[PDB]
Paper text:
The nucleoside proton symporter (NHS) family proteins are part of the major facilitator superfamily and are responsible for transporting nucleosides from the extracellular environment into the cell. In this study, using X-ray crystallography, molecular dynamics simulations, and biochemical assays, we discovered that the deprotonation of Asp323 in NupG, or the equivalent Asp315 in YegT, (another NHS family member) triggers a local conformational change in the TM10 region of NHS transporters. Notably, this protonation site is part of a novel motif (GXXXD) located in the middle of the TM10 transmembrane helix in NHS proteins. Further biochemical studies suggest that this local conformational change in the GXXXD motif plays a role in coordinating substrate release, ultimately facilitating substrate translocation.
We introduced a point mutation in YegT (YegTK267A) to improve the quality of the crystal and crystallized the protein using the lipidic cubic phase method. Through molecular replacement, we determined the structure of YegTK267A at a resolution of 3.1 Å. The asymmetric unit, contained two YegT molecules, designated as molecule A and molecule B. Notably, both molecules were captured in nearly identical conformations, with a RMSD of 0.17 Å across 332Cα atoms. Notably, Lys267 is located in the loop connecting TM8 and TM9, which is distant from the substrate-binding site. This placement ensures that the mutation has minimal effect on the substrate-binding region. A structural comparison between two NHS members, NupG and YegT, revealed that both proteins share similar structural features, with an RMSD of approximately 1.57 Å across 316 Cα atoms, despite having only about 27% sequence identity. The protonation site, Asp315 in YegT, and the corresponding residue Asp323 in NupG, are situated within this conserved motif. Given that the measured pH obtained for the crystallization condition was 5.8, this strongly suggests that Asp315 is protonated. Notably, the side-chain carbonyl oxygen atom of Asp315 is located solely 2.5 Å apart of the main-chain carbonyl oxygen atom of Glu255.
Residue numbers in the entry:
A (entry chain B): 1 to 187, 193 to 403
B (entry chain A): 1 to 186, 193 to 403
The structure:
Amino acid sequence: MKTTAKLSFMMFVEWFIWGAWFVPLWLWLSKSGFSAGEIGWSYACTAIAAILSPILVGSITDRFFSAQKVLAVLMFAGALLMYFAAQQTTFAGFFPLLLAYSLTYMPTIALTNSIAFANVPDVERDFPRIRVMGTIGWIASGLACGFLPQILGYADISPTNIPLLITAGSSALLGVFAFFLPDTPPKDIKVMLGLDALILLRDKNFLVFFFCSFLFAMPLAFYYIFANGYLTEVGMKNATGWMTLGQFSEIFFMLALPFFTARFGIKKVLLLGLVTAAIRYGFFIYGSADEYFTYALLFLGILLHGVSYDFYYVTAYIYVDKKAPVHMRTAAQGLITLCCQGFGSLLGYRLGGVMMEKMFAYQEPVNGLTFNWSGMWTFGAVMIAIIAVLFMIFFRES
Amino acid sequence: MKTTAKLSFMMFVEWFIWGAWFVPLWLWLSKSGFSAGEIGWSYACTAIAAILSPILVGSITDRFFSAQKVLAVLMFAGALLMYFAAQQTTFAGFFPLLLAYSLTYMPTIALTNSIAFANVPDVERDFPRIRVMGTIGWIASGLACGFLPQILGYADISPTNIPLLITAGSSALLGVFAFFLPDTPPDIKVMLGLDALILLRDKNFLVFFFCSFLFAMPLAFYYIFANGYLTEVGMKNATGWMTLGQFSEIFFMLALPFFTARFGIKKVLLLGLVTAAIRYGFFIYGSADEYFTYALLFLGILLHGVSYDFYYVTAYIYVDKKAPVHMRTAAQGLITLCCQGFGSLLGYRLGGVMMEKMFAYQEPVNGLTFNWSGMWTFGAVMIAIIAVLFMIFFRES
Ligand SMILES: CCCCCCCC/C=C/CCCCCCCC(=O)OC[C@H](O)CO
Ligand SMILES: CCCCCCCC/C=C\CCCCCCCC(=O)OC[C@H](O)CO
């Protein structure tokens, strides 16, 4: 029970619980009678909570409560709120409980990486090694949810609420484990996220980056709300655990990434992630698992998801850091996260969801598919292509 | 993972939770600057929740919620409320969260009895078996709290909050364990008493109601002052050694039926009374300075359970015997709500400010910050006078 290894367990569980439910959710909702647009709103809960929680963390670190004491009760509230949500037959009863849970979860991200940062001897020695534990625990929820139950004699739980239950149980666990976590002190103008960072848009490169990133987030939201549903509808078994190849891919390919970034330069690497997200979505157009070649395309798409994340998200953060004034880089990160990764995420979810029910929903299933999945992946791949070319020509740097 | 045993674990943890924090709370509250009165109110919280709880259980099921799901929700709520309370530094912050926790909790008791009752095949065979598991869990909390932390190299937790955190953790556990629980399905506030209020016109029933109302006020002295006294008298692991009363209740249950058939309910009721009196006398004279004092201390813990069985169960038996068969459960609810509930409330607070105002030592001497032996005198002959008042004023058949 060493203090640093304590930190690692709490990181692991913290992202374990978000994973346990985020990935399977579509299958249980479509099967329990939701429609594409209801489901889109359900995944939009995520983006709303993301953009709204800096406010909440102003509330939640401002007051004298130290982070570990807070995380215990936010975790307990989350277990309660989502158990309640998990028992919901309807969209009307289900949605507000998901939004409530989401609001009490997303501050914990900050809480937990605060407690890791404060109580670790060397930041560059231990912080990275703590924060990959988050990815590890995402993996663990995935394997627990797509592989473990079948190992004990049960069938795929993805079309059922048990993932919703796993997350609740894990919340409960992290709650109790917050007793044994070291003391972490906390650390009032609401306008910090935006106004600090809005006047950085005047630089041309920064604006093209900002708005092409914001466009990026909307097709890229298709993956998180549809990949598992489609993967299983097209015949891949244990899809919710096989999707951890994107996580393993991120982890392992990022060692290869810095040597990339040196040899080619940020504009090349920024659009390289773009092109492999395009390629990946194409793989999802044509893959359908009946034959080994289409199956291989499925797996390769998941791989290049982690490749694509490493190419774009991490260098993007770097770019903002080297490109922003030091007092203001935390502000700018807050900002691009806020709209790009928050409003672009919401746009992605609901654009895609109502677009599916309006233009793709099958009236009666054909060959196991109740959606023209290939068609939507193709929409998104095409749109990635043409936002990508704009960024190729509308922006340049050295 | 069988319906047979799943309920047993449920009852175990369910009363484990009440036990964890209830016995030790005095030590920590007192050792964090509280006063005897604020402590009295704190123990009174649980009685208030008991008082107000049928209201909450009459709104729990009316909206068609399955007992196991709502229980999961309530255990989670109690975990959170208990953590908050446990991080509290003064009575003003501590009290409201305790009251909230308790209100979340004591509907759980009913709920868990519902869930247990529904899903055993033979209820008169297998219900008692689940009922003992609650007291066994209460035993487990005692032991785990006043014995296990020394085993791991840590000093006594009874003066710290940790009981409070142990409570939170077990709340969270039973909460999660409610997922695996079998399915148990489910508006006049007046129903709990007015049914039974008209029963009081029998004079024996009034005498019994009134004198158990009196009896329950001294009787609360034990729960609120016993651990503090026992430890301040130098008994170590007191919080664990106090489970002997629980044990003795369990084992003395087998000698109860043959006791209750041999002299009736008058003698056996006041036998409950008398053993509670004399064990209070043992409390007035025991200490650990000498071996014999020590022997008194342990015997007084045993006589708790003996006194409890006698009174608490043959009284229930008496009202069932004495109540019309629709109204018997209403009758239960009434005497448990005012006698066991209001009497407890007034015992806790009466004693709290009693010791605050007329028993607090300016400067602790011989380890004692109170004239404990004085309070036990007060209580023991309060028991005595109520005992004789009962002695002549109550007739049987
Ligand atoms: C009151 C009116 C006065 C005018 C108001 C401000 C002028 C408008 C432009 C401001 C850029 C502000 C920062 C100027 C320097 C920016 C450089 C920067 O962004 O960081 C450098 C980084 O290394 C990249 O390579
Ligand atoms: C200012 C106080 C006014 C009086 C308040 C009344 C309450 C009782 C008071 C004192 C009894 C304490 C005396 C305890 C006897 C000590 C005897 C002793 O010295 O040791 C024991 C024995 O001798 C070993 O062999």
